[PDB]
Amino acid sequence: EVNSCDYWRHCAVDGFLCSCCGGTTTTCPPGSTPSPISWIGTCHNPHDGKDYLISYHDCCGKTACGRCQCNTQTRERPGYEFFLHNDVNWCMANENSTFHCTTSVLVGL
């Protein structure tokens, strides 16, 4: 279920799901580096009915994973609200900015 674009935590993912790329929801595939910065989504948990902050950290420094591409946009906003915006490469400040895949890290309520 975590490998589907419909999975609730993925509500603002624009990119490849890391869990399809040899990583998990919260870990980079071997040899790709987490971004320290990220866009953030607010996603609805269908089980408890509460909204949670999800941090969409990229994994960087390897070329495109190419698997499980998602382009979901719940509560996503343009670049004038920059940390809510997902049409930019959140690897942009890494030592190597090549985009590999995206994670969906649960922050909290």
Binding site: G61, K62, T63, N96, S97, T98
Partner: peptide, 12 residues
Amino acid sequence: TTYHERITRGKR
């Protein structure tokens, strides 16, 4: 555009 010395590593 963006280059790096070795694409996925090296100077930007």
